[PDB]
């Protein structure tokens with residue numbers, strides 16, 4: 001999930017997809033594939 | 034009479050990480066403040082002692098925090114969608130108090146490279162595109178601005194509450 005200016009922080013599977021719900025683009029930002 | 038505080042900010046971005054700011058503010062037709070400098074050292078001045086030392090220092094602090102957040106948002110749009118540099122952004126904003134007594138009219142319009150881009154709608158505190166050219170950049174910028182309390186409600190409150198009280202106090 002995104003909060004104000006959080007997206008300037010490096011992507012994090014734990015912070016973004018486990019502690020929060022992440023959308024597909026947020027997941028892709030972690031995969032870097 | 035129509036009582037108002039206008040604020041203008043021009044931001045020249047040489048690249049994502051460096052910006053030169055140039056701005057000012059006016060109460061009616063009277064110039065009251067100037068802002069100028071690189072992102073690392075932006076000078077903010079009240080031309081006349083309108084606010085006492087402590088209160089001015091608090092206003093300056095809020096403006097410096099805003100500048101870092103504004104730059105941060107431009108850097109984020111670039112990292113996520115790619116922006117073509119150099120670019121110039123102009124923010125023109127303010128509050129206008131009708132003589133009759135109705136609710137203050139406010140605005141916050143953003144232009145990029147001299148053309149209309151996005152602007153704030155205070156009724157529901159939402160941003161809309163002012164350009165009809167669709168792009169990943171416009172869509173993303175609007176998604177971000179419409180996603181947070183900070184860029185919606187806090188921004189509306191700066192215009193409708195902080196700005197309005199400033200006009201009521203320093204013009205009279």
Ligand SMILES: CCCCCCCCCCCCCCCCCCCC(=O)O[C@H](COC(=O)CCCCCCCCCCCCCC)COP(=O)(O)OCCN
Pocket residue numbers: 040041042056057058066067068077078092095096099102103106107110116122124143145174183184185186187188190191195196197199
């Ligand atoms: C009214 C008091 C007046 C005192 C005297 C005036 C001083 C004048 C001196 C300076 C000259 C004027 C020029 C600068 C104007 C700055 C505007 C400040 C607004 C501000 O602080 O906004 C805060 C929100 O910021 C945010 O949300 C940060 C981001 C905002 C969005 C910007 C939109 C640009 C879009 C860029 C996207 C990228 C596009 C890519 C091409 C909310 O205000 P607050 O913190 O006071 O809280 C109030 C709630 N309590």
Ligand SMILES: *[C@@H]1O[C@H](CO)[C@@H](O)[C@H](O)[C@H]1NC(C)=O
Pocket residue numbers: 041042043055056057064
């Ligand atoms: C106020 O700021 C604007 C930014 O576009 C600038 O063009 C204008 O000349 C400034 N006014 C003064 C008196 O410096």
Ligand SMILES: *[C@@H]1O[C@H](CO)[C@@H](O)[C@H](O)[C@H]1NC(C)=O
Pocket residue numbers: 116117118119120121145146
């Ligand atoms: C803004 O204008 C500059 C200088 O003309 C140009 O190099 C740049 O691509 C433009 N950036 C935009 C439209 O975001």
Ligand SMILES: *[C@H]1O[C@H](CO)[C@@H](O)[C@H](O)[C@H]1NC(C)=O
Pocket residue numbers: 182
């Ligand atoms: C807006 O910001 C967050 C939502 O993520 C929350 O902590 C806060 O309570 C919200 N604002 C208000 C006034 O409810």
Ligand SMILES: [Ca+2]
Pocket residue numbers: 001002003006015016020
């Ligand atoms: Ca998050």
Ligand SMILES: [Ca+2]
Pocket residue numbers: 001002003006007016026
């Ligand atoms: Ca995120």
Ligand SMILES: [Ca+2]
Pocket residue numbers: 007010011012016026029
């Ligand atoms: Ca992310």
Ligand SMILES: [Ca+2]
Pocket residue numbers: 014015019
């Ligand atoms: Ca954890």
Ligand SMILES: [Ca+2]
Pocket residue numbers: 015019020
């Ligand atoms: Ca979190």
Ligand SMILES: [Ca+2]
Pocket residue numbers: 007025026029113
């Ligand atoms: Ca993202």
Ligand SMILES: [Ca+2]
Pocket residue numbers: 025026029113
């Ligand atoms: Ca992305």
